[PDB]
Design an enzyme around this catalytic site. Structure first.
Site, PDB file in Angstrom:
ATOM      1  N   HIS A   1       1.264 -18.102  25.272  1.00 38.37           N
ATOM      2  CA  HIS A   1       0.673 -18.464  26.545  1.00 38.37           C
ATOM      3  C   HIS A   1       0.658 -19.996  26.629  1.00 38.37           C
ATOM      4  O   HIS A   1       0.324 -20.668  25.657  1.00 38.37           O
ATOM      5  CB  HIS A   1      -0.750 -17.924  26.599  1.00 38.37           C
ATOM      6  CG  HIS A   1      -1.587 -18.472  27.725  1.00 38.37           C
ATOM      7  ND1 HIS A   1      -1.489 -18.013  29.015  1.00 38.37           N
ATOM      8  CD2 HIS A   1      -2.579 -19.396  27.719  1.00 38.37           C
ATOM      9  CE1 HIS A   1      -2.367 -18.661  29.766  1.00 38.37           C
ATOM     10  NE2 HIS A   1      -3.052 -19.488  28.997  1.00 38.37           N
TER      11      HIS A   1
ATOM     12  N   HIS B   1       8.724 -21.070  29.592  1.00 43.51           N
ATOM     13  CA  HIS B   1       8.132 -22.385  29.250  1.00 43.51           C
ATOM     14  C   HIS B   1       8.946 -23.281  28.331  1.00 43.51           C
ATOM     15  O   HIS B   1       8.461 -24.299  27.878  1.00 43.51           O
ATOM     16  CB  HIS B   1       6.691 -22.214  28.709  1.00 43.51           C
ATOM     17  CG  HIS B   1       5.749 -21.606  29.688  1.00 43.51           C
ATOM     18  ND1 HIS B   1       5.426 -22.245  30.863  1.00 43.51           N
ATOM     19  CD2 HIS B   1       5.045 -20.446  29.671  1.00 43.51           C
ATOM     20  CE1 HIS B   1       4.579 -21.479  31.549  1.00 43.51           C
ATOM     21  NE2 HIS B   1       4.333 -20.380  30.846  1.00 43.51           N
TER      22      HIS B   1
ATOM     23  N   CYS C   1       7.004 -27.757  37.656  1.00 39.08           N
ATOM     24  CA  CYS C   1       7.623 -27.374  38.930  1.00 39.08           C
ATOM     25  C   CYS C   1       6.478 -26.806  39.754  1.00 39.08           C
ATOM     26  O   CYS C   1       5.861 -25.815  39.364  1.00 39.08           O
ATOM     27  CB  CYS C   1       8.719 -26.313  38.684  1.00 39.08           C
ATOM     28  SG  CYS C   1       9.990 -26.887  37.533  1.00 39.08           S
TER      29      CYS C   1
ATOM     30  N   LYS D   1       6.476 -18.495  41.666  1.00 40.05           N
ATOM     31  CA  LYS D   1       5.327 -18.891  40.866  1.00 40.05           C
ATOM     32  C   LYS D   1       4.831 -20.208  41.413  1.00 40.05           C
ATOM     33  O   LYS D   1       5.640 -21.091  41.703  1.00 40.05           O
ATOM     34  CB  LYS D   1       5.750 -19.015  39.408  1.00 40.05           C
ATOM     35  CG  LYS D   1       4.618 -19.082  38.420  1.00 40.05           C
ATOM     36  CD  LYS D   1       5.106 -18.811  37.009  1.00 40.05           C
ATOM     37  CE  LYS D   1       4.003 -19.171  36.017  1.00 40.05           C
ATOM     38  NZ  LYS D   1       4.410 -18.811  34.644  1.00 40.05           N
TER      39      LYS D   1
ATOM     40  N   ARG E   1      15.824 -33.109  35.691  1.00 39.24           N
ATOM     41  CA  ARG E   1      14.358 -32.875  35.874  1.00 39.24           C
ATOM     42  C   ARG E   1      13.859 -33.392  37.229  1.00 39.24           C
ATOM     43  O   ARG E   1      12.693 -33.819  37.339  1.00 39.24           O
ATOM     44  CB  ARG E   1      13.524 -33.437  34.717  1.00 39.24           C
ATOM     45  CG  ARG E   1      13.914 -32.836  33.381  1.00 39.24           C
ATOM     46  CD  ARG E   1      13.578 -33.786  32.256  1.00 39.24           C
ATOM     47  NE  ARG E   1      12.151 -33.943  32.020  1.00 39.24           N
ATOM     48  CZ  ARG E   1      11.635 -34.732  31.091  1.00 39.24           C
ATOM     49  NH1 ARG E   1      12.443 -35.487  30.356  1.00 39.24           N
ATOM     50  NH2 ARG E   1      10.329 -34.794  30.911  1.00 39.24           N
ATOM     51  N   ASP E   2      14.699 -33.241  38.246  1.00 38.53           N
ATOM     52  CA  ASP E   2      14.353 -33.483  39.631  1.00 38.53           C
ATOM     53  C   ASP E   2      14.037 -32.155  40.347  1.00 38.53           C
ATOM     54  O   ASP E   2      14.005 -31.111  39.727  1.00 38.53           O
ATOM     55  CB  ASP E   2      15.492 -34.243  40.324  1.00 38.53           C
ATOM     56  CG  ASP E   2      16.815 -33.442  40.407  1.00 38.53           C
ATOM     57  OD1 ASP E   2      16.951 -32.422  39.679  1.00 38.53           O
ATOM     58  OD2 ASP E   2      17.767 -33.831  41.173  1.00 38.53           O
TER      59      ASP E   2
ATOM     60  N   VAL F   1       0.476 -30.493  24.599  1.00 36.09           N
ATOM     61  CA  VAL F   1       0.378 -29.223  25.297  1.00 36.09           C
ATOM     62  C   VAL F   1      -0.656 -28.299  24.687  1.00 36.09           C
ATOM     63  O   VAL F   1      -0.957 -28.366  23.506  1.00 36.09           O
ATOM     64  CB  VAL F   1       1.727 -28.488  25.401  1.00 36.09           C
ATOM     65  CG1 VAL F   1       2.751 -29.382  26.126  1.00 36.09           C
ATOM     66  CG2 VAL F   1       2.245 -28.047  24.043  1.00 36.09           C
TER      67      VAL F   1
END
Length: 120
Positions: free
Chosen positions: A113, A12, A80, A39, A20-21, A102
């Protein structure tokens, strides 16, 4: 005793992404070991670590729902999301860049987590 914090960083945290594409997501999901099986959704937080750890204290966080913490500051993030029906590689990903607070869970003052629901 803080191996879950290391796992949190692996899953994370990405300090200084460029692009960031979609191709970013495809490469980083493989590199971080999240591509066998693929994932379904995974979000990386960018910037410095100290701000992320500070969510675990009043400095940069508040209690949230039953047992989580929510940041006061907004972070650059990238989500993603898996494209295609197969949970097995190759894993194609769609990137969505964002900028918001966040939600995490903390243990011993460290994030362990990320709540993915806010990125759906």
């Amino acid at each position: 005793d803080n191996s879950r914090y290391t796992h949190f960083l692996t899953q994370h945290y990405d300090a200084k992404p460029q692009g960031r594409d979609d191709r970013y997501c495809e490469a980083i999901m493989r590199r971080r070991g999240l591509a066998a099986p693929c994932k379904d959704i995974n979000t990386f937080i960018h910037g410095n670590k100290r701000s992320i750890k500070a969510i675990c204290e009043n400095k940069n966080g508040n209690p949230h729902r039953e047992n989580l913490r929510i940041s006061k500051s907004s972070f650059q993030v990238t989500t993603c999301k898996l494209h295609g029906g197969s949970p097995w590689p190759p894993c194609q990903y769609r990137a969505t860049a964002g900028f918001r607070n966040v939600v995490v869970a903390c243990e011993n003052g460290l994030p362990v987590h990320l709540d993915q629901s806010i990125f759906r």
